[PDB]
Every structure is written in C-alpha cells, then in structure tokens.
Amino acid sequence: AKLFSVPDFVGDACKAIASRVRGAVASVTFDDFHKNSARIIRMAVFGFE
Amino acid sequence: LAIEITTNSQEAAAKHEAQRLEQEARGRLERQKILDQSEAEKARKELLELE
C-alpha cells in the first residue's frame, strides 16, 4: 500500500528532479553546463558518491 | 556577453595554439636549415680544396 502513497507518483518525481537540476544548473555557468550537461544533471539528481 | 567571453576565449586559445605550432615550424625549420648548410660545407671544403 506504500506504492499508492504518493497519489501522483510521476508528478512527485518530475517535480523533485526538475527542482534538483533547476537548482544545480543555476550555480553552473552556461559554457560549463553545455560541455558537462551529462554529468551536471546526472549528479544533480543523485546524491554523489 | 557571457557567450561573448567564451567565444573570444575560443578565439584566443586557438590563436595561442596556431602560434605554438608556428613556433614548432620555424624552430624546427631554422634547425634543419643549419644542418643542411653544414652538410654543404662538408662538400664545399672539398670543392674549395680543388679550387
């Protein structure tokens, strides 16, 4: 029943990912983003180890 | 102006590069040249002896 916890499970997720990226990219310079967008996002989403 | 700086940043370090490669050329050329003239002098002596 935990599955059906978040009622908009997709909405929950994008909401959270968009925000994480949106916030991490604001820190980053454009050129710096454009070259590393792969890793930039890829980190922003997951708690880097 | 933010892409401006990166656009000229490309410019610059590209012109720095072609300049470094430029060096390589004249640096090597000036030296192959010397090693040629010296080879010529190894002959010129013999010629100058007959002369």
Curated annotation (Swiss-Prot), chain B:
Function: Required for normal vault structure. Vaults are multi-subunit structures that may act as scaffolds for proteins involved in signal transduction. Vaults may also play a role in nucleo-cytoplasmic transport. Down-regulates IFNG-mediated STAT1 signaling and subsequent activation of JAK. Down-regulates SRC activity and signaling through MAP kinases.
Name assigned to this protein: Major vault protein
Full-protein positions shown: 660 to 710 of 861
UniProt free text on domains: MVP 3 mediates interaction with PTEN. MVP 4 mediates interaction with PARP4.
Cross-linked sites for Glycyl lysine isopeptide (Lys-Gly) (interchain with G-Cter in SUMO2): 45
Organism: Rattus norvegicus (Rat)
Gene: Mvp
Disulphide-bonded residues: none
Post-translational modification, as annotated: Phosphorylated on Tyr residues after EGF stimulation.
Domain of life: Eukaryota
Subcellular location: Cytoplasm; Nucleus
Subunit structure and binding partners: The vault ribonucleoprotein particle is a huge (400 A x 670 A) cage structure of 12.9 MDa. It consists of a dimer of half-vaults, with each half-vault comprising 39 identical major vault protein (MVP) chains, PARP4 and one or more vault RNAs (vRNAs). Interacts with TEP1. Interacts with PTEN and activated MAPK1. The phosphorylated protein interacts with the SH2 domains of PTPN11 and SRC. Interacts with APEX1. May interact with ZNF540.
